[PDB]
Amino acid sequence: TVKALTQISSAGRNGVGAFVLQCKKLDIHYSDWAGSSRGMNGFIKSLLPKFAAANPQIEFVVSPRPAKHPILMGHYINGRTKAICVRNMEPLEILKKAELLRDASGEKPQKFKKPVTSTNPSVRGVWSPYHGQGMAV
Amino acid sequence: NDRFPPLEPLPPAAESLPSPLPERALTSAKLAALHARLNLSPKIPLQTLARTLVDASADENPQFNNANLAFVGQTLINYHIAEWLLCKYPRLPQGILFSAMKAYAGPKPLLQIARSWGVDTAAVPGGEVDPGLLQFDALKPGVAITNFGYKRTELAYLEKFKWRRGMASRVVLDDDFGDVVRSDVSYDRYGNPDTRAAAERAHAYFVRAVVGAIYAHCGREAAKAFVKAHIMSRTLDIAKLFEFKYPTRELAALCAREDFEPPVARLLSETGRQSRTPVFVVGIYSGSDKLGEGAASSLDHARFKAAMNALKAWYLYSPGENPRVPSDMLEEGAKPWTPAYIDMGEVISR
Amino acid sequence: AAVEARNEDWMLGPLAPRRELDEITLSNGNFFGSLSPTRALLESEVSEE
Amino acid sequence: PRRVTPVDKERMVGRWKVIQKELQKRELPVLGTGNHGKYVELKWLGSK
Amino acid sequence: QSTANRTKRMLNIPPHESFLNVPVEGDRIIFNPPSSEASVYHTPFKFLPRSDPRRRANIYKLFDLPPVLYNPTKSYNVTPEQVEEIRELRAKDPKKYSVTYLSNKYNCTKVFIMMCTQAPREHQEQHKLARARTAENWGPRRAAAKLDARRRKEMLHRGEI
Amino acid sequence: TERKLVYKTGYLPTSVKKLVHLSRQIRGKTVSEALVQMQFSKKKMAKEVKTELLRAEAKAIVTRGMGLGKAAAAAAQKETGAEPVKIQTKDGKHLEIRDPTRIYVAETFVNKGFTRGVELDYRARGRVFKMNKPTTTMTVVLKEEKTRIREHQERVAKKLRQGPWVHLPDRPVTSQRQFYSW
Amino acid sequence: PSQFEVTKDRKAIKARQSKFLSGEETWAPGKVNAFLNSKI
Amino acid sequence: KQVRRFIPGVGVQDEVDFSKVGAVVRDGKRAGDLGVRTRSDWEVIGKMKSVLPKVKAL
Amino acid sequence: MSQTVGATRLAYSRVWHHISAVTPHPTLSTIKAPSEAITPPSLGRLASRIATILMGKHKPIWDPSTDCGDYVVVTNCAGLYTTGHKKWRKTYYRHNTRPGSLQAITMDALMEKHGGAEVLRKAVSGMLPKNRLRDKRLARLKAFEGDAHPYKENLVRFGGKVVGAPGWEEAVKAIREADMERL
Amino acid sequence: QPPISQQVKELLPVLAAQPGHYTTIHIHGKPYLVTEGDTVKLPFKMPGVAPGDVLRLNRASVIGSRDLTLQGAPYVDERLFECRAIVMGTESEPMRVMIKKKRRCRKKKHVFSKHKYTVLRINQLKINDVSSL
RNA sequence: GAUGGGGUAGCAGAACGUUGAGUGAAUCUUAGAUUUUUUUUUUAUAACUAAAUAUAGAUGAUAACUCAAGUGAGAAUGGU
Ligand SMILES: [Mg+2]
Ligand SMILES: [Mg+2]
Ligand SMILES: [Mg+2]
Ligand SMILES: [Mg+2]
Ligand SMILES: [Mg+2]
């Protein structure tokens, strides 16, 4: 008699079969008054129009935010957000920061420990002392 | 206020509508991003993708909602996942075949697929919300999608008096996943197990609708590719869905049915007997062939665990990792079809 | 005190305490919801300006 | 064109229209501080 | 150690000797049977359909049995008429004609006696209480070890143990 | 759902190192148990802790409405023959709660207050040192037995959720190498 | 604290304590702790 | 295979797949010149309410 | 990471090994010819092989922090092999911090009070890492003077034949020939 | 091109017929033992790649199954297998501060390091049929 | 497919921060300015995101650039 368990679901592997860009939305906030927003205003007029055209899968919302530094807040599919203050950064420095949010994921920063990350079992099962030629002390 | 003009121009009689108008979808940056995030074909306009986000809980109209789009899509997902599992694991018991279906095209996985697409829900449905938001009402579970399953005459006595329900009857009466059929407003409250299920159901109908939309617009082949890329691309260990009762009897009944020699448990290896954590490697042999192997701490458990592994190997037999499905023939000019292995059925034991 | 009493009624609900039946606040010597003769009669000598 | 406030976000999500009815029923002020005066206890005592 | 790089060199384990014999003059395929437990997906040839062409001699060929643990025997010593006697005695006095008494007299397994007949309800409830009165004499340390034994068995059949 | 009273005593003429031992004695006990230990204590401050603990209980009953179900609770024990609840505190003491409304000392700590006075200690060689006369306060958090029953049910549930002990555990290998060692 | 003369406020809380414990009056939540508009 | 990119100095490079080999870089002052789908394109796509997939393919 | 995904139960299980201090060891002996001169493993050379098992350093999943060691049942410790005059000229020392309380004893005198099992424990003990796992690993060394011990049923087996028995090898190769009859 | 060995032409069908397969790809010489579906996190920012780019890995040191193992002398022939990855994005670590200091010297020089890492996803690992070759 | 990379005494260059002032009769703030905290992100002696608590319309705060210093403390048996 075999009884089915009803508490196990399938897991998704982004990239296998279909790929989905993690950055769902990017929020650009500028000040018409703050001096630190001089470079942001230049990025919204020259580099954002073409950058937003190359990433049709990202939602861009350009809204002002006076009395505040300029920030680039990116919302990701995992629910988290990453805000980068770009005060006193030239336009080309904003584009390098905006591409950082695009290529990035919501995951929190972690130290490099292991290159490979796998969820499938070993092709050659884990070692066992009872499945070999035996060891004689 | 004059100091805070409205960000989005909308008529005065907007919030009174169940959902935003169709033309509203043509000025929303969330849909344009959602359309490009899934690489949908340009044949699917934004007015159609906006209709896949309006659940029947928000718009009772047969149109403007997700009722019909999700119905056509559910049949495509359920069909492609069914044929693919019978061709890959043609010996799976019926019980495990229902859980595997519910593990791929069920409300739980589809909910994760909807959240993998960056689809954020709306608090309360209305004509003012962004068309790119999933609209539904978790407080009204009245709406129920139409399914091919029929209601059982003894359903009342089934839930109350614990009457027996067989597996062979679920393929006709029960739904596609083996479950039975038919099993002003104050928002000052908290979440409920009813809303959690109503919200999870709303996400599943959206994913299914996207397949129905791709079908009506792009065609059958495009819909199959979308299902094969987002749903079938997921990982599931079907070996973990097995729960055995008296596996030693089921194995004896299997060898008896297949004429194999009666199974005999032999002790391949052992160590630490008369200790706190011994190890007994018991292998069940049918004559001189090794059917299965199990290593446990108790002599009895090692024999039971070996019988399960011998039974899983029988049911989990796979002709190939990527076998051909019967739907591949109807595409066009395909290679001649080769008959697929059809098992007789799972073993019924004492 | 009113900032903390408004938070308990919002939280405790049916267990809101009967503050009117409590002891006085020795920090002032006043009862619940009662002013002081100096603060109720405004007998405080104010500057000329 | 203007700064997005917490009110605008609720309007997009649809929850604003539900906040107006509740606050109105309870008589609390919808957008504003209502017709309530400022703290005067210290002022009446000659507070600088 | 001081850095992670040094810690990695001290905790190193070399690869299996089969991989160390890297080939020369070209590519080759070597037979490398690992010393591990095979998965339930390596279906034995005995469980492969007669149509499956993948059936083939051992890949090793392309380049007494162990001790018995459980070999039961089935016996049928009860006739169709004796089954009627088992149902009469069990209902006449379920205390004297217990399953162990009938199992001995009729030379059958104790389970088989239970299959033909069951004791009257009030007698079954008496059995469940006897085991319930002994479960209350268990302290917090024994009653917890018994619940684990009942959960490890459930976990074993769920593929967890 | 659970009543609670945070009562801060008055300024007692004692130190923290002296009164702390009196607060750790009544910790976890019932108001009645604590009062009996203060009546028969040899410490001078036990007389002030007994008066301050009777005031706290008066406030817990009038303002918070605690310990006002003894008559009703007693009816369910004997009249209906209901067996009381058996729990075990975090420290491990087993209790039999016949009245879920009984008040007890959930938490208790001591805080130091202002300085009573200053006495000069005149030593030899014409040296003088100041001696600070301390004053301390005590804070007791009175709760009902409904809290100890709930907290107990959470611990036993947390223990049954950690799974049983398995003989051969699947311990992980915490090191990745780009090759097979077996 | 044991030598402080009991004031009129402490002589009233002792009379209520004997009334709630006796069963004459039934305890009820406070209604004048704060004048909120929600009234919940 | 390279997804669409924006070269800060040249312009928007359309998607190119070297498996079938075309890196075309379009630069301009209007959304149409860039070679992407504009709001106007989405409006004409939504007005073609008559196009329908072939029944044989459906 | 896939290499470590699976059932690590049997990799961490304790295996009960066995070795006799009198059986010649062609590997752990300094004499290799003639075969009739092959001696057993000397005291220190046997202790170096045992310390490797107690640490689990013979396993491909070894980790110094994890106690992945095994048991080693040593028999015939009375005929423990030693070279030269170690048996009568080697000395073991002891001091309890009290000046004048220096305790000395030779190997032959220590083998009379606590048998050869204590001489093998001090050797293995000094070859183990000086940490908090030294007492657990050493406790898994079962040393006995003769052929009898309470672990004759714990010794690892392969088809009923204890490792080191006459026909244990052919019993292992016979079980692996059947494991190849599968995909 | 150099013809494949006759011994590899007869056992490769048996290698691809088994359930699972693994490979040891070599990116810039460094090996990575991966399986179809794994996620490789390279310790460097691959220049000139955006999330969604598909890469074809052509340097494999070992491509083996449970029992069989294919080994090339420098590497395996590309015509035997086909491995592809997809660029998933770039990740960064937390800032680490290193304090370079000497005894009896107040100056503490700080070194701030925050590296980026390219993340891949092995979406294809299949062995080809070389019956014709 | 540029070259270079430890450092005391010591020399040199480039910056941040603190306090006050100018632009400033400027800019922003119950659609939450400010909140000694917590949290998030960014090559970061710094700012930023968000949360929690309290409630200000200026004797409030403030970008940018510049000006002037009672301008940066684990070390003086230092002082309070
Ligand atoms: Mg004097
Ligand atoms: Mg150097
Ligand atoms: Mg230098
Ligand atoms: Mg704050
Ligand atoms: Mg100092």
Which of H12, H13, H45 is closest to H30 using CA atoms?
Answer: H12
| Cα(A96)–Cα(A101) distance, integer angstroms | 9
For chain D, give the number of residues.
48
| Cα(I65)–Cα(I67) distance, integer angstroms | 6
| Cα(B57)–Cα(B195) distance, integer angstroms | 12
Q: Is F111 helix (H, G, I), strand (E, B) or coil?
A: strand
Q: How far is the CA of A87 from the C1' of K65 (A)?
A: 15
Alpha helices (H) along chain E: 4-10, 17-20, 59-62, 82-92, 99-106, 110-116, 121-135, 142-157
For residue B165, which phi and psi values (nearest 5 degrees)?
-130, 120
Report residues 3-32 of A contacting strand K, contact meaning Cβ closer than 7 Å. none
CB contacts of J12 in chain E (<8 Å) are 29
C-alpha triplet I20, I24, I26: angle, nearest 5°: 125
| Cα(D21)–Cα(B188) distance, integer angstroms | 12
Asked if residue J109 keeps its beta carbon closer than 7 A to nucleic acid strand K, the reply is yes
**Helices and strands in chain F, H and E counts:** 5, 5
Q: Residue B316: which H helix or E strand, with range?
A: none
CB contact under 8 A, A131 and E36: yes
Which long-range contacts link I145-153 to residues 24+ away (Cβ below 8 Å)?
A: I145/I76, I145/I77, I145/I78, I145/I115, I145/I116, I145/I117, I146/I75, I146/I76, I146/I78, I147/I75, I147/I76, I149/I73, I149/I75, I151/B274, I151/I16, I151/I18, I151/I71, I151/I73, I153/B273, I153/B274
Radius of gyration of chain F (CA): 25
For residue B221, which phi and psi values (nearest 5 degrees)?
-60, -40
Q: Which residue has the tokens 């059929």?
A: B181
For chain C, give the number of residues.
49
CB contacts of C28 in chain D (<8 Å) are none
Q: Which residue has the tokens 């100095």?
A: H9
CB contacts of F167 in chain B (<8 Å) are 276-278, 296-297
Which of B243, D17, I81, A129 is closest to E34 using CA atoms?
Answer: A129
CB contacts of F59 in chain C (<8 Å) are 22-23
Q: How far is the CA of J82 from the C1' of K41 (A)?
A: 39
Q: Which residues of A109-129 are buried (b: 16+ CB within 10 A; e: fewer)?
A: eeeeeebbbbebbbbbbbbbb
Q: Is E20 helix (H, G, I), strand (E, B) or coil?
A: helix
Q: Is F32 helix (H, G, I), strand (E, B) or coil?
A: helix
Task: Note whether F41 and F29 are within 8 A (CB).
Answer: no
Which long-range contacts link H7-10 to residues 24+ away (Cβ below 8 Å)?
A: H8/A47, H8/A92, H8/A95
Closest-CA distance, D29 to chain C, in angstroms, reads 18
**Protein-covered nucleotides on strand K (Cβ within 7 A):** 6-8, 27-33, 40-44, 47-49, 53-57, 59, 61-65, 75
| Cα(G6)–Cα(G9) distance, integer angstroms | 8
Closest-CA distance, E158 to chain A, in angstroms, reads 8
Q: Is G30 helix (H, G, I), strand (E, B) or coil?
A: coil
Which of F106, G12, G2 is closest to C18 using CA atoms?
Answer: G12
Q: How far is the CA of A117 from the C1' of K72 (A)?
A: 47
Whether A134 has its CB under 8 Å from any CB of chain E: the answer is: no
| Cα(I159)–Cα(B287) distance, integer angstroms | 16
- Using CA atoms in the order B271, B275, B276, B280, what is the torsion angle rounded to 10 degrees? 30
Nearest to J40 among A17, A109, A116 (CB): A116
For chain I, give the number of residues.
183
Let me know if chains A and G touch, i.e. at least 3 Cβ pairs under 8 angstroms.
Answer: no
Candidates E42, E63, E155, E156: best to mutate against I (most CBs of I within 10 A) is E42
Q: Which two tokens stand for residue I49?
A: 């092989």
Q: Let me know if F34 is exposed, middle or buried by CB neighbors in 10 A (0-12, 13-18, 19+).
A: buried
**Residue A100: closest CA among chain J residues belongs to which residue?**
J90
| Cα(B288)–Cα(B179) distance, integer angstroms | 43
Q: Is D5 helix (H, G, I), strand (E, B) or coil?
A: coil
CB contact under 8 A, C47 and D46: yes
| Cα(D4)–Cα(B6) distance, integer angstroms | 10
| Distance from Cα J94 to the centre of ligand 4, integer Å | 25
CB contact under 8 A, A124 and I156: no
Q: How far is the CA of C4 from the C1' of K52 (A)?
A: 15
The interface residues of chain E toward chain A in range 43-72, judged by CB-CB distance below 8 A, are none
- F140 CB neighbour count, 10 Å cutoff: 25
Whether B180 has its CB under 8 Å from any CB of chain H: the answer is: no
| Cα(I136)–Cα(I69) distance, integer angstroms | 9
Q: Which residues of I1-14 are buried (b: 16+ CB within 10 A; e: fewer)?
A: bbbbbbbbbbbbbb
Whether J37 has its CB under 8 Å from any CB of chain B: the answer is: yes
Whether B89 has its CB under 8 Å from any CB of chain E: the answer is: no
Q: Is A24 helix (H, G, I), strand (E, B) or coil?
A: strand
Which of I52, I80, I25, I11 is closest to I141 using CA atoms?
Answer: I52
Q: Is F73 helix (H, G, I), strand (E, B) or coil?
A: helix
Task: Note whether E119 and B267 are within 8 A (CB).
Answer: no
- I149 CB neighbour count, 10 Å cutoff: 16
Task: Note whether E78 and E114 are within 8 A (CB).
Answer: no
CB contact under 8 A, I8 and F171: yes
Q: Residue F103: which H helix or E strand, with range?
A: strand F103-122
| Cα(I72)–Cα(A137) distance, integer angstroms | 8
The interface residues of chain H toward chain B in range 19-38, judged by CB-CB distance below 8 A, are 37
| Distance from Cα H44 to the centre of ligand 5, integer Å | 79
Asked if residue A37 keeps its beta carbon closer than 7 A to nucleic acid strand K, the reply is yes
Write the single-letter amino acid at J126. K
Cis check: omega of the bond before J94, within 30 degrees of 0: no
| Cα(I87)–Cα(I94) distance, integer angstroms | 18
CB contacts of I6 in chain J (<8 Å) are none
CB contact under 8 A, E38 and A133: no
Q: Residues with Cβ < 8 Å from E82, sequence gap 6 or more? A: E106
| Cα(E104)–Cα(E87) distance, integer angstroms | 15
Q: How far is the CA of A67 from the C1' of K34 (A)?
A: 13
Resolution for this model in angstroms, one decimal place?
3.0
Which of B184, B204, B35 is closest to B113 using CA atoms?
Answer: B204
Whether B317 has its CB under 8 Å from any CB of chain E: the answer is: yes
| Cα(E71)–Cα(J78) distance, integer angstroms | 53
The strand pair at J22-27 and J54-57 is best described as unpaired
Residue closest to K49 C1′ by Cα: A83
Q: Is F143 helix (H, G, I), strand (E, B) or coil?
A: strand
Q: Which two tokens stand for residue I43?
A: 């005291």
| Cα(B335)–Cα(F50) distance, integer angstroms | 95
Task: Note whether F9 and F131 are within 8 A (CB).
Answer: no
E25: left (phi over 0), alpha (psi -120 to 50) or beta: left
Asked if residue J111 keeps its beta carbon closer than 7 A to nucleic acid strand K, the reply is no
Can you give the three-state secondary structure of chain I, one letter per residue?
A: CHHHCCCCHHHHCCCEEEEECCCCCCCCCCCCCCHHHCCCCCHHHHHHHHHHHHCCCCCCCCCCCCCCCCEEEEECHHHCCCCCCHHHHCEEEEECCCCCCEEEEEHHHHHHHCHHHHHHHHHHHHCCCCCCCHHHHHHCEEECCCCCCCCCCCCCEECCCECCCCCHHHHHHHHHHHCCCEC
Task: Note whether B347 and B253 are within 8 A (CB).
Answer: yes
Asked if residue A84 keeps its beta carbon closer than 7 A to nucleic acid strand K, the reply is yes
CB contact under 8 A, G40 and C33: no
Q: Let me know if A36 is exposed, middle or buried by CB neighbors in 10 A (0-12, 13-18, 19+).
A: middle
The string of DSSP codes covering C11-44 is HHGGG---GGGSPPBTTTTB-TT---HHHHTT-P
Task: Note whether B217 and B43 are within 8 A (CB).
Answer: yes
CB contacts of E31 in chain J (<8 Å) are 67-68
CB contacts of H11 in chain A (<8 Å) are 50
C-alpha triplet A86, A91, A97: angle, nearest 5°: 50
Whether B63 has its CB under 8 Å from any CB of chain J: the answer is: no
CB contacts of G38 in chain D (<8 Å) are 26
F9: left (phi over 0), alpha (psi -120 to 50) or beta: beta
Which long-range contacts link A97-103 to residues 24+ away (Cβ below 8 Å)?
A: A97/A72, A98/A26, A98/A43, A98/A48, A98/A51, A98/A72, A99/A51, A100/J90, A101/A23, A101/A26, A101/A72, A101/A74, A102/A21, A102/A23, A102/A26, A102/A55, A102/A58, A102/A74, A102/J50, A102/J51, A103/J50, A103/J51, A103/J89, A103/J90
Handedness of CA G14, G20, G26, G27 (dihedral sign): positive
| Cα(B294)–Cα(B287) distance, integer angstroms | 18
| Cα(C22)–Cα(C30) distance, integer angstroms | 11
What DSSP designation does C46 have?
P
The residues whose Cβ lies within 5 A of ligand 1, an ion, are F 126
Asked if residue A102 keeps its beta carbon closer than 7 A to nucleic acid strand K, the reply is no
CB contact under 8 A, I180 and E60: yes
| Distance from Cα J109 to the centre of ligand 2, integer Å | 15
- A84 CB neighbour count, 10 Å cutoff: 15
User: Measuring from the CA of residue A71 to each C1', which nucleotide is nearest?
Assistant: K48
| Cα(B201)–Cα(B209) distance, integer angstroms | 12
Q: Which two tokens stand for residue F89?
A: 């505190």
For residue I169, which phi and psi values (nearest 5 degrees)?
-70, -55
**Residue D41: closest CA among chain C residues belongs to which residue?**
C39
| Cα(B70)–Cα(B74) distance, integer angstroms | 6
CA distances from B321 to B88, I74, J131 (A): 7, 50, 20
J57: left (phi over 0), alpha (psi -120 to 50) or beta: beta
| Cα(J74)–Cα(E21) distance, integer angstroms | 13
Q: Residue F74: which H helix or E strand, with range?
A: helix F70-77
| Distance from Cα J100 to the centre of ligand 2, integer Å | 13
Experimental determination technique: cryo-EM
Radius of gyration of chain I (CA): 19
CB contact under 8 A, E36 and A133: no
Whether H39 has its CB under 8 Å from any CB of chain B: the answer is: yes
The string of DSSP codes covering A55-118 is -TTSEEEEEE-TTS--EEEEEETTS-EEEEE-TT--HHHHHHHHHHHHH--SSPP-----SEE-
Subunits adjacent to chain I (3 or more Cβ pairs under 8 Å): A, B, E, F, J
